[PDB]
Amino acid sequence: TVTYTNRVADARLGTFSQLLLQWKGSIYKLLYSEFLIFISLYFAISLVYRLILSESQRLMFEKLALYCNSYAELIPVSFVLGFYVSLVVSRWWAQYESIPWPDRIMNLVSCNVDGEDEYGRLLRRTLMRYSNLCSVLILRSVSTAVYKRFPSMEHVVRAGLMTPEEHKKFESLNSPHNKFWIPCVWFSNLAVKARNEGRIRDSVLLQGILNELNTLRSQCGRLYGYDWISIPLVYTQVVTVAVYSFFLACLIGRQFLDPEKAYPGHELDLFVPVFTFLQFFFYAGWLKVAEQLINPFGEDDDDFETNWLIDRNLQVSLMAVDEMHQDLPILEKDLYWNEPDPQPPYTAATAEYKRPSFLGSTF
Amino acid sequence: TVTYTNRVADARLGTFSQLLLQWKGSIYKLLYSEFLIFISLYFAISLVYRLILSESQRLMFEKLALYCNSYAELIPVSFVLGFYVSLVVSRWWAQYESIPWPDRIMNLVSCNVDGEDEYGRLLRRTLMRYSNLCSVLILRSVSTAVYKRFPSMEHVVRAGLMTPEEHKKFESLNSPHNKFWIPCVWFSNLAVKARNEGRIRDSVLLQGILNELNTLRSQCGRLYGYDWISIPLVYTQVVTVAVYSFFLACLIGRQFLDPEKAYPGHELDLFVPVFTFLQFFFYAGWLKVAEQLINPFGEDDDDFETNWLIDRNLQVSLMAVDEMHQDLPILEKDLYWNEPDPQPPYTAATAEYKRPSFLGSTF
Amino acid sequence: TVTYTNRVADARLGTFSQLLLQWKGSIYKLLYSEFLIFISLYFAISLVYRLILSESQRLMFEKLALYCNSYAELIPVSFVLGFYVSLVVSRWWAQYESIPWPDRIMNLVSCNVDGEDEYGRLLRRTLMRYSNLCSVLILRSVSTAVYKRFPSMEHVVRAGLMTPEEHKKFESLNSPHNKFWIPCVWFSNLAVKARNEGRIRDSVLLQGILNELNTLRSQCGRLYGYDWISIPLVYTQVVTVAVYSFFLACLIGRQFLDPEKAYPGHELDLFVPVFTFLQFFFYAGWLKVAEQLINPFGEDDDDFETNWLIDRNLQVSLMAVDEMHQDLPILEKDLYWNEPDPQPPYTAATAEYKRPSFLGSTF
Amino acid sequence: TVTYTNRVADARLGTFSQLLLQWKGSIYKLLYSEFLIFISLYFAISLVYRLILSESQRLMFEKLALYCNSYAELIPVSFVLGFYVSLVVSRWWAQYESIPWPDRIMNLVSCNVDGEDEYGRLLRRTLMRYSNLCSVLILRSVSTAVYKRFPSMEHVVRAGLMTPEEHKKFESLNSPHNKFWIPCVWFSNLAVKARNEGRIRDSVLLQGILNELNTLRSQCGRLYGYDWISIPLVYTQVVTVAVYSFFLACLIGRQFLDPEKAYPGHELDLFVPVFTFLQFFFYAGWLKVAEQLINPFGEDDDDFETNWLIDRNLQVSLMAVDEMHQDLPILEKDLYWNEPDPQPPYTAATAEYKRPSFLGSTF
Amino acid sequence: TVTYTNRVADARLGTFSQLLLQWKGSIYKLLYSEFLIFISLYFAISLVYRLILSESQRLMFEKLALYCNSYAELIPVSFVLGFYVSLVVSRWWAQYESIPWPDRIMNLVSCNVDGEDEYGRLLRRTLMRYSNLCSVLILRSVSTAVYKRFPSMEHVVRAGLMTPEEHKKFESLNSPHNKFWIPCVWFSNLAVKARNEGRIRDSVLLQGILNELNTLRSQCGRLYGYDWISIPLVYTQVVTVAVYSFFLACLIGRQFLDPEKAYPGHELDLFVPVFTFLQFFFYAGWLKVAEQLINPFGEDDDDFETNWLIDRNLQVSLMAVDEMHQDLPILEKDLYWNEPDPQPPYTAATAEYKRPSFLGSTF
Ligand SMILES: [Ca+2]
Ligand SMILES: [Ca+2]
Ligand SMILES: [Ca+2]
Ligand SMILES: [Ca+2]
Ligand SMILES: [Ca+2]
């Protein structure tokens, strides 16, 4: 995504002021086309009122501009954007926590599957390759950034995520439904086959591996759930009527009428509404928070970088069960072997952050 | 339901604008009958004011139209729709997560119940058939889309979800209460009977199966809970008084009075209120979000497709414990057997999504 | 409670319109006495203004009616009802999920406590009778609907929930505090006594039973917590001042003044305020949502039917560990023994609900 | 706290009306001193305007009173009280659920630690005494009601929560940080020492005890977390500026100006503002909800009664592992030994609460 | 952070009034520079209007000041600050609960890893040193207060958190991604190596240690998640446009116009706006709640004191597995050996807090 966490660590003077100058993933990149439509529809109405209309027709238009200005109220639109965006953002973070990480299975496979030989090394690599394949097959079904990377099953085989003997089995299992559950069943049968040859010692270690598989299966079941059960379409169509009804009234009610007749509220002619345009960046920009996060697996600048994460999870999983299985650093006494009060040193810029120990608020 | 997740992946120009043109499951299909009642009651009042009423009676009506326009305020109605719909939508997603999925039991039954013979294959099919039957009997009690598919117990037997010898036992258990708990007790006794014949090796594998049964029993207990304990009727009757009190005031307060008397606020006669009708699509359409989601197991276009999901869960469960029990693809070295840095390839349209690795915000 | 889930399954025309006509548990049964107080205090003021007051006193009253009409504003009252009712309803559903269900213990006791003889059958009935007694003793402490059914310990013994030999032990345990924890300790010692005679095979099955006891103990600890720690009284007294301050201003500010003096806002005399009474059904009815749900174990029409649920949990628990212990239907091949694509049939009214399988949004 | 759950069980007429008459823990006991400051500052301004000021100075004051009345608006203050109190109340209930209860450890220690002799009885009393001591040492650090009961370690020894041989060990462990974690480490080593002498049979029962210890350790870690990480001080200082800015404007803007000049809005002189004082009970009373719950372990009338709960948890824990270890009532056939349909009897006042069994909404 | 929990324990008179006088971490330290910009831009406009502008130009400016005063409305800005700060604060507390604590692993390592000799003591110190190193490597990636303490890997070795033989292994593991997962894999292999030499007795104790490792791995995975997936930048840029659009209108609309022309609303010249400046402390100060909590690991006065917590977790973990392994106080009969009703004594200031036991609300 767009990470600006380093910029906003402290509350300086230009903390949020400098974030308005950024372009990538900003409000300006989203509202670029909607602004020029709103400018062009605004000044077309103003040039008709200032050049084209006759005197009897300008009086007819000024009664229309005072009628539209009454319904152009800001308060009830801010309600329905507030409860809708709070629904989208709560669904947004819940889909990030549903993205499966191999690291809980990675710890147990790398220690409880014995064997330093060729067959035991091959057994640990195949277990973790199924756990990655059970995650690639659910991300390519829900993320357009992954589906363009893997458009077919042949692209999965060419990437090494599925050997060609597995694809021959994967096609013979004739099922019309989605097949993301299949590598998470091959994980269960290979782990039990590992137990029956003595690669796992006890049943408690086998059940501990199978419990972390079903955690990863429930993670993939949530991503299938948020993708299939969208936000209700009637509740998306409400909040986009109310935003477009507000901006329809502001095309007519926020014109600059002729001050020589001196209507109440239009005493000054300024040729460009500064504060009406700033409400367009406010209200339409707070709708673009909903348009960008309603599917966080697309190709926006703030959607999830899932193509990166597949490349991370493949490299890390095949490194911890292959190059780190029973390969430990040599045990040695640390620096605090005889010191019961360890005091790690401070640098110069951090030495004012030495706080006394918090004993409790009652002291 | 109605899935539009593919349309709203990116934040383009016509992202939410194109969703207003869709018909199925939209605001127009719900508000079709309420709109024509509101049009017919509106213009009946206008034709009486413009044709039927005398001059002394029009003056009596104009004082009524200015009285009703004061109570036709929009702000406090938007409060009580906001907190009510946020209750319905939070209950809406919590009932989707209560729909039981067999896949956690499906992994453990397909690996820990040994036997490739006829009796062991028959034992795994009967365990998963009880877990599906314990879900069909709770969905036909809470979903009108399932009850019309299975109106009696005889339809369950004809669908193969219950053998006729089981229905003879299911009727002899004389109980006045709902009997969805019975197949989840038959699962427990058959799994212990499987252990005593040596089909399950250790007690830890038996307890791991029985823990995933009680998870599925707690899933069925929530669907029984949301169906029995509705949203409070006094709290549904409040939010439908406040919407109908608003539209009652807008039938009289939003008339176009005679501009020749020039009341403040009614200076223009336009013969059709454009912005009053757009508030009808806003407020009554944001009540139809509550009317459609208050029971998401009915037959609306956005209620849950549970008839599909029974057909999925029956086909997948009897495929993973029958055709996939100890039927593995042949183990083979993958492409990254000697490469400690796996780099899966990118397509042409995805090659700009190569990001450097996120090391942390402090770097 | 009042279940109307069958009525609101679909979004028809008269979906929420027909719910206003229902009486039981409605807004009309709650606001019956408060409405007649508000009518009688309203028209008493109006008859004094129209018959009793002199001309100099009516002028003094009209300045009071314009003063009270300024403070009779609707917006800030709707805030504090919104956040207060959202607190009550979140506490309301959290107390339903704290009501203990025996069904998770019922599965494990009915399969892991061996013995088809007289002593083993008596052992399973006593385990489940303690789990029901540990729930009756916490419901009679928190629910007035249960305490009127069981006013003393003698009513518990006459209902068969406690044998007279257990009450002799239950009184000798001299403790001033509440004794709902005692049957959940007798469950632990009887389950360990069952293990030492060989009725439970392994320690893993014993710990699986004891884990589901402590789940039920934590359920009873929440019901003790919500009953002892109420909503703060200062926060209940705020929201009932603001509702009564609003209705105090509407008794004077919403009078119909004399239109012959033509005050701004009171141009019409109508003898009965229609929209002021509809705000009484709105605001006072949205306070009755809080008055009814602040203790959902009382005797309102929408409080929890806990007297029913004790009769269910006693009949079901003593049926699954007695008549269903190792009493299985005969294993038999189902209809889909040779069909790898099960297609359960559809009825006539459900045949349009055949959907193609959802493969994912990217397809 | 103040428990009024018995009063508000039903929705009668005077349900919330009678709660305004209560004194203890009410809005009147909190706002007693702030009201007399607000009365004395109000009528001091009024007596200066009515007696002290000259004619040219009263005209200068009336322009100030109309200026302050414009900023005395109620709507934006109600926002920031609503989101702040909803933060406090969500943190309030989360600290009650963090208060550790011994009852989950109490079940497992009372059954799995064998021995009816003197040493086995002494072993169970010492395990539960560490679990109470690990809770007293965290409550005296976070609760001022407990710290005044136990000001030093010597008061803990005199209360019998720590034997003098344990305090000699508790002081030799030289650590500057808070030492609430020490009795939860002594519990782990004594439970393993119990296993190695044969007092606990299997490792599964030992791990089941140690899992319920770490649950209680995570409960004490939350109370340390809510006490150390307060609500942000900048977010407390915002909501108390906005309340005091509102009441500063109401000291001048809500004066009764002279009606002989007849300003718009001040047409009547009434000598005491009734509705301005009722907004003081509303807004300042809804700030006292935040002032009382921001530390629920203090000595307010609605803070948590934790001194009571230590006396409960000490008496109950040493009663269930001492007088109830393997002391069971005699097993006997209950009343429903031969009746498969148990029907417990109803009293006279409860016989109308016989409901038919809820089969599901689709029936 | 800034802990004021001792001050606000009771609801006294000056409870929240005294918090405005505090400087550290307050609203005044954050708004110090933004206030002087707002003062200097305000009085520059006022001195131009009072000294520089001509008579025809002052009339042109007064029409601009009445135009800007209409858009300077407070209500819709308070919506979008309310939903944005409620998002930040919910993410704020969720990152505190993601900070890993060693104390759950600390209990199990200190009891289940046998051996009082030199090798067994060295084995327990190395297990807990990996669990601290797996937390330092994730905090130095997300916290600028920790990264300035440990700028490189060489500072980790000099602090004794990593022996130089481990850094030689830590560099040979060639991976471009972040390496916080590596010490949580070394923990798994050393714990299994401990089992194979007989330092851990059974597999159930080994799986209990490995389950508490993966809990700590999921804690570190959340801190990596909140740091990488920020609040959406478009949703931060909306709420800072709306605050700055409000203050732009208040620089012109809140001027004091000339009262000799007597515009409606500007009847009095007061030379300094008191209530406009108090809205600056309100609105801009309620934006500084968001600016300070959006990254709670920085160096603000209310960000998390994580440098302290590393020094605590290092001292406590190496004290409980070294000086407290099987070092128990001597078992002895407590004071309540023969008293079945323990009554711990009360002090003088706490003796009025003797409450009778809460039996339940129905009594
Ligand atoms: Ca997107
Ligand atoms: Ca529906
Ligand atoms: Ca009630
Ligand atoms: Ca307090
Ligand atoms: Ca910060």
**Residue A205: CB partners within 8 Å, gap ≥ 6?**
A108, A112, E203, E206, E207
Q: How far is the CA of C13 from the centre of ligand 2 (A)?
A: 13
Nearest to C160 among D267, D334, D361 (CB): D334
Chain B residues touching residue D363 (CB < 8 angstroms)? 141
Task: Report whether B112 contacts B198 (CB < 8 A).
Answer: no
Q: Compute the nearest-CA separation of A342 from chain B (Å).
A: 26
Question: How far is residue D230's CA from residue A358's CA, in Å, rounded to a whole number?
Answer: 13
Chain C partners (3+ C-beta pairs within 8 A): A, B, D, E
Tokens encoding E299: 């160096």
Chain B residues touching residue A219 (CB < 8 angstroms)? none
Question: How far is residue A276's CA from residue B104's CA, in Å, rounded to a whole number?
Answer: 55
Question: How far is residue C362's CA from residue A156's CA, in Å, rounded to a whole number?
Answer: 16
- Is the Cβ pair E177, B357 closer than 8 Å? yes
Of E135, E133, E127, give the one whose Cα is nearest residue E98: E135
Q: Which residue of D has its CA nearest to B173?
A: D340
Convert D88-126 into a string of H (helix), E (strand) and C (coil): HHHHHHHHHCCCCCCHHHHHHHHHHCCCCCHHHHHHHHH
Q: How far is the CA of B300 from the centre of ligand 1 (A)?
A: 27
Q: How far is the CA of D226 from the centre of ligand 4 (A)?
A: 14
Residue D74 sits at φ, ψ, to 5 deg, of -100, -25
Q: Compute the nearest-CA separation of D60 from chain C (Å).
A: 24
Question: How far is residue C287's CA from residue C291's CA, in Å, rounded to a whole number?
Answer: 6
The label of the residue with tokens 């005209």 reads D59
Question: How far is residue A353's CA from residue C357's CA, in Å, rounded to a whole number?
Answer: 59
Going from the C-alpha of C196 to that of each of B251, C200, D117, the distances in angstroms are: 79, 8, 18
Q: How far is the CA of E234 from the centre of ligand 5 (A)?
A: 19
Of B140, B165, B174, give the one whose Cα is nearest residue B155: B140
Question: How far is residue E99's CA from residue D222's CA, in Å, rounded to a whole number?
Answer: 12
Chain D residues touching residue A208 (CB < 8 angstroms)? none
**Residue A77: CB partners within 8 Å, gap ≥ 6?**
A242, A243, A246, A283, E76
Tokens encoding C317: 């628990």
- Is the Cβ pair E362, C228 closer than 8 Å? no
Chain B partners (3+ C-beta pairs within 8 A): A, C, D, E
Q: Compute the nearest-CA separation of C135 from chain E (Å).
A: 14
- Is the Cβ pair A361, D174 closer than 8 Å? no
Question: How far is residue D5's CA from residue D7's CA, in Å, rounded to a whole number?
Answer: 5
Give the ligand at the shortest distance from the Cα of B232.
3
The label of the residue with tokens 């008493």 reads C44
| Terminal C-alpha separation, chain A | 44
**Single-letter code of the amino acid located at B133:** L
Q: How far is the CA of E291 from the centre of ligand 5 (A)?
A: 7
| Terminal C-alpha separation, chain E | 44
Question: How far is residue A255's CA from residue A66's CA, in Å, rounded to a whole number?
Answer: 10
Rg of chain D over all Cα atoms, to the nearest angstrom? 30
Give the ligand at the shortest distance from the Cα of A293.
1
Q: Which residue of C has its CA nearest to B162?
A: C334
Question: How far is residue C174's CA from residue D271's CA, in Å, rounded to a whole number?
Answer: 63
Chain D residues touching residue B142 (CB < 8 angstroms)? 360-362
Of E60, C355, D341, give the one whose Cα is nearest residue B306: C355
Of E236, E78, B282, B16, give the one whose Cα is nearest residue A286: E236
- Is the Cβ pair C360, A227 closer than 8 Å? yes
- Is the Cβ pair C141, E363 closer than 8 Å? yes
Q: How far is the CA of B110 from the centre of ligand 5 (A)?
A: 51
Candidates B336, B346, B357: best to mutate against A (most CBs of A within 10 A) is B336
DSSP annotation string for D178-219: --TTSHHHHHHHHHHHHHHTTSS--HHHHHHHHHHHHHHHHH
Question: How far is residue C260's CA from residue C257's CA, in Å, rounded to a whole number?
Answer: 9
Nearest to D360 among B142, B174, B176 (CB): B142
Rg of chain E over all Cα atoms, to the nearest angstrom? 30
Asked whether the CA dihedral D308, D311, D314, D319 is positive or negative, the reply is negative
- Domain range annotation of chain B: 1-332
Chain C residues touching residue E363 (CB < 8 angstroms)? 141, 147
Of E265, E104, C259, D203, give the one whose Cα is nearest residue B63: C259
Question: How far is residue B139's CA from residue B98's CA, in Å, rounded to a whole number?
Answer: 11
Say how far residue B313 (Cα) sits from the centre of its chain. Answer: 18
Convert D268-283 into a string of H (helix), E (strand) and C (coil): CCCCCCHHHHHHHHHH
Q: How far is the CA of D222 from the centre of ligand 3 (A)?
A: 32
Give ∠ CA C294-C297-C298 in degrees, rounded to 5: 85
Q: How far is the CA of D252 from the centre of ligand 1 (A)?
A: 52
DSSP annotation string for B87-132: HHHHHHHHHHTTS--THHHHHHHHHHS---SHHHHHHHHHHHHHHH
What are C's interface residues with A at a Cβ cutoff of 8 A? 340-341, 357-363
Question: How far is residue A134's CA from residue B267's CA, in Å, rounded to a whole number?
Answer: 67
Task: Report whether C178 contacts D312 (CB < 8 A).
Answer: no
Q: Count CB atoms within 10 A of the CB of residue E117.
A: 9
Secondary structure (3-state) at A2: coil
Chain A residues touching residue E314 (CB < 8 angstroms)? 342, 344
Of E186, E55, E42, give the one whose Cα is nearest residue E128: E186
**Residue E263: CB partners within 8 Å, gap ≥ 6?**
E62, E66, E257
Q: How far is the CA of A288 from the centre of ligand 1 (A)?
A: 10
Tokens encoding E57: 């130009």
- Is the Cβ pair E85, D235 closer than 8 Å? yes
Q: Which residue of A has its CA nearest to E245?
A: A278
Secondary structure (3-state) at A304: coil
Q: What is the total residue count of chain E? A: 363
Alpha helices in chain E (DSSP H): 27-30, 32-47, 55-71, 75-96, 103-112, 118-142, 144-147, 153-158, 164-172, 183-196, 203-228, 233-250, 274-293, 306-320
Q: How far is the CA of D294 from the centre of ligand 4 (A)?
A: 6
C177 exposed, middle or buried (CB, 10 Å; 0-12, 13-18, 19+)? middle
**Residue A247: CB partners within 8 Å, gap ≥ 6?**
A38, A280, A283, A284
Residue A53 sits at φ, ψ, to 5 deg, of -75, 145
- Is the Cβ pair C123, D89 closer than 8 Å? no
Nearest to A19 among E202, E227, E236 (CB): E236
Q: Compute the nearest-CA separation of C200 from chain D (Å).
A: 14
Question: How far is residue B279's CA from residue A80's CA, in Å, rounded to a whole number?
Answer: 13
Q: Compute the nearest-CA separation of C168 from chain B (Å).
A: 33
Question: How far is residue C142's CA from residue D5's CA, in Å, rounded to a whole number?
Answer: 9
Question: Resolution in angstroms for this experimental structure?
Answer: 3.1
- Is the Cβ pair A295, B9 closer than 8 Å? yes
- Is the Cβ pair A149, B350 closer than 8 Å? yes
**Residue E115: CB partners within 8 Å, gap ≥ 6?**
E121, E123, E199
Give the ligand at the shortest distance from the Cα of A288.
1
Chain C residues touching residue B66 (CB < 8 angstroms)? 267-268
Q: How far is the CA of B301 from the centre of ligand 2 (A)?
A: 8
Give the ligand at the shortest distance from the Cα of B88.
2
**Single-letter code of the amino acid located at D120:** G
Method: cryo-EM
- Is the Cβ pair B357, E176 closer than 8 Å? yes
Question: How far is residue C128's CA from residue C100's CA, in Å, rounded to a whole number?
Answer: 13
C21 exposed, middle or buried (CB, 10 Å; 0-12, 13-18, 19+)? exposed
Question: How far is residue A131's CA from residue A162's CA, in Å, rounded to a whole number?
Answer: 11
Of A279, B89, A75, A241, give the one whose Cα is nearest residue C74: A75
Tokens encoding B267: 């200076």
Of B195, B178, B177, B187, give the one whose Cα is nearest residue B215: B187
DSSP annotation string for E160-206: TSS-HHHHHHHHHS--SS--TTSHHHHHHHHHHHHHHTTSS--HHHH
C117-124 CB contacts, 8 Å cutoff, 24+ apart: C120/C199, C121/C322, C121/C325, C122/D331, C122/D333, C123/C190, C123/C194, C123/C199, C123/D331, C124/C321, C124/C322, C124/C325
Q: Compute the nearest-CA separation of B253 from chain D (Å).
A: 25
Of D9, D313, B287, give the one whose Cα is nearest residue C298: D9
Of C205, C210, C207, C198, give the one whose Cα is nearest residue C119: C198
